[PDB]
């Protein structure tokens, strides 16, 4: 697994198991959550759940995250959060800032037995989630004039681009593409690109390509598969858009998309769909999203065998046959029946 965000294992010596913080989250979170707990149980995962609550405090007007949850998550070097609502400083933002998360990993692959307009889409994108267009820095320079400031540093760039080379290696993809726009953002995007070009050399097994978002978006939409040996790295904004785009190609929404937020020693794995408050409790949610983030987590932890088990078989395979599936995929099954129907081929 990638050297950069390395898990420091250590199963809890008293139990055979590893400790993982949950964060069930709200809305369809609870149901989607225990759905995962059950499937995990069945496969005999070396994992005990230490669920914690990230409902924000407000130390110094600036929104902070509760000590209970901090201690828990800093301890077990990993957590798996479901969706949460919109409670004075982005909840997700103060979540990355307090745990040093700096890289968003977003895969979008076609699902077996769910037909969308685009086919054979298997995409992987790493996004810088620290700086870039999304630093808090903007100014009113005078009456009707505003500056939003895009920040790009070598330190922040280096460590994302690394995780990308190392992740591309860890999943056996030859090519790694740096999406940019050095064309008109000479210095900003130029630095990003050079930093990749310089790192390129200490990863000779991978081939580095450079592409303008221009083409990255043109080419991916004309033919998604041209990047099935991908791993694309890019600064915060291009990343935020391309990843939400990639998901649009793979599934037409993002109710199937898993994300991984890698930090230096910590790392959080979440589903990117919302809290779906109106379907909450009625048992219609679709664990697949969070479930795949579980797999991502497994691999990040080193539990290859279990991950491949829960992914290659189960869900991925049980999402074949409309008696299974959920309402969101034409299927008729409940969150309930999806989970047992999954564990069968588990």
């Amino acid at each position: 697994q990638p050297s950069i965000g390395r898990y420091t294992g250590k199963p809890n010596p008293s139990t055979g198991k590893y400790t993982v913080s949950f964060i069930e989250g709200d809305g369809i979170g609870p149901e989607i959550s225990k759905s995962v707990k059950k499937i995990f149980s069945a496969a005999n995962v070396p994992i005990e759940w230490e669920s914690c609550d990230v409902s924000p405090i407000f130390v110094n007007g600036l929104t902070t995250i509760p000590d209970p949850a901090v201690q828990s998550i800093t301890k077990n070097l990993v957590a798996l959060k479901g969706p949460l609502a919109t409670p004075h400083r982005s909840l997700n933002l103060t979540l990355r800032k307090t745990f040093g998360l700096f890289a968003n990993v977003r895969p979008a692959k076609s699902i077996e037995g769910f037909k969308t307009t685009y086919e054979n889409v298997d995409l992987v994108l790493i996004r810088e989630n620290t700086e870039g267009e999304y630093s808090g820095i903007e100014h009113i320079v005078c009456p009707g004039v505003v500056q939003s400031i895009k920040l790009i540093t070598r330190d922040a760039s280096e460590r994302v681009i690394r995780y990308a080379f190392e992740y591309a290696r860890a999943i056996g993809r030859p090519r790694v593409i740096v999406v940019h726009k050095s064309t008109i953002q000479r210095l900003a995007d130029g630095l990003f690109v050079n930093v990749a070009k310089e790192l390129s050399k200490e990863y000779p097994d991978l081939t580095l390509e450079t592409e303008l978002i221009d083409n990255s978006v043109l080419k991916v939409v004309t033919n998604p598969s041209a990047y099935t040996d991908a791993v694309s790295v890019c600064p915060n904004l291009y990343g935020d858009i391309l990843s939400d785009l990639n998901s649009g190609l793979s599934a037409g929404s993002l109710g199937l998309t898993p994300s991984a937020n890698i930090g230096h020693k910590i790392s959080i794995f979440e589903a990117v769909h919302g809290s779906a408050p109106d379907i909450a409790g009625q048992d219609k949610a679709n664990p697949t999203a969070l479930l795949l983030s579980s797999v991502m987590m497994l691999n990040h932890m080193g539990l290859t065998n279990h991950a491949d088990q829960i992914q290659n078989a189960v869900l991925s395979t049980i999402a074949s046959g409309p008696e299974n599936r959920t309402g969101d995929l034409a299927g008729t099954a409940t969150t309930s029946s999806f989970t047992e129907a999954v564990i069968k081929r588990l």
Binding site: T117, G144, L151, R154, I184, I213, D214, N215, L218, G248
Partner: protein, 329 residues
């Protein structure tokens, strides 16, 4: 009776794709004379020319990515003429296999501002700031252009693409000014907002929900290329740039085709179609209505079409089918 239009072939398939238009033009004996220019900083002479003639037809220039490279000079042209509005036309064509069919959307972007403002510096080594400017005047301008455009071409919906949830001042201002002046002027038109990333997802998955999209420089490049792909490719997209005094017409997709320069494989549909846009502009348009039907029917009519659409014909051959169909109208 004779217009004198500026012609800027530019880099890549530029030279070939322009020629296609010339040929179709003299073969239709259209009363326009090209003043044609070629060029490192003589982007001056392009400006100076356009300032005389007011109207131009151009391909794309190439832009370096290296540090000591010169800088767009496609944007230089626009900034120096304050041709602030870009219009790209993404309408699918009959004889072209596309994944989602019957698609008709327009993307209007601001040309001179936003992330194309080209202000950047390195404070200490390894730390770079790129400043993105957004100003009320330049924004009210494009906002009205978009609505005016939507009214003129009976478009019912106008949507502002932004990232105002994160860049609350920059993109915020943009989203407000647009919706703000689509409500107290242009009340007949449906104004709305959409976040650029989510817009990107709908565009690829369910594009029919969009009509007209107004965006700052960057988001327009992105949604632009989504639209370009959606309809077949960069060779099918008509484009035009508008300032108050001048108008420059170019392909709506904005690709140089450096790799296939001189190979006569290129597709001139883009160039020709935006060339027709120019005719409608300077009032001709009997010709425009004409020579558009020509290319439209040509490509719908299976083979004899150019490589990238799924044919095996060369730029040369495709051109001549148009001039041929045209000779019998």
């Amino acid at each position: 009776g004779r217009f004198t239009v500026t012609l800027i072939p530019g880099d890549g398939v530029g030279k070939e794709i322009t020629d296609s238009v010339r040929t179709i033009f003299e073969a239709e004996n259209i009363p326009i004379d090209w003043e044609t220019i070629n060029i490192k900083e003589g982007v001056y002479e392009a400006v100076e020319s356009l300032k005389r003639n007011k109207i131009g037809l151009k391909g794309l220039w190439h832009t370096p990515a290296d540090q000591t490279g010169h800088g767009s000079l496609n944007v230089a042209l626009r900034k120096q003429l304050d041709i602030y509005a870009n219009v790209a036309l993404f309408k699918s064509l009959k004889g072209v296999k596309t994944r989602i069919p019957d698609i008709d959307l327009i993307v209007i972007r601001e040309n001179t501002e936003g992330e194309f403002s080209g202000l950047e510096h390195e404070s200490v080594p390894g730390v770079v700031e790129s400043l993105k400017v957004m100003t009320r005047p330049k924004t009210e301008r494009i906002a009205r252009f978009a609505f005016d455009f939507a009214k003129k071409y009976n478009r019912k919906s106008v949507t502002a693409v932004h990232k105002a949830n994160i860049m609350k001042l920059g993109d915020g201002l943009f989203r407000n000014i647009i919706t703000e002046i689509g409500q107290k002027e242009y009340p007949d038109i449906d104004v709305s907002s959409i976040i650029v990333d989510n817009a990107s997802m709908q565009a690829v998955a369910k594009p029919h929900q969009f009509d007209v999209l107004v965006t700052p420089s960057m988001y327009g490049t992105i949604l632009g290329n989504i639209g370009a792909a959606l309809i077949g490719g960069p060779g099918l997209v008509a484009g035009a740039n508008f300032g108050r005094d001048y108008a420059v017409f170019e392909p709506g997709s904005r690709h140089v085709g450096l790799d296939i320069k001189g190979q006569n494989v290129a597709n001139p549909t883009a160039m020709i179609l935006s060339s027709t846009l120019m005719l409608n502009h300077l009032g001709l348009n009997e010709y425009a209505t004409r020579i558009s039907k020509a290319v439209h029917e040509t490509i719908a009519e299976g083979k004899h079409t150019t490589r990238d659409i799924g044919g095996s014909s060369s730029t040369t051959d495709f051109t001549n089918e148009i001039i041929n169909k045209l000779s019998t109208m």
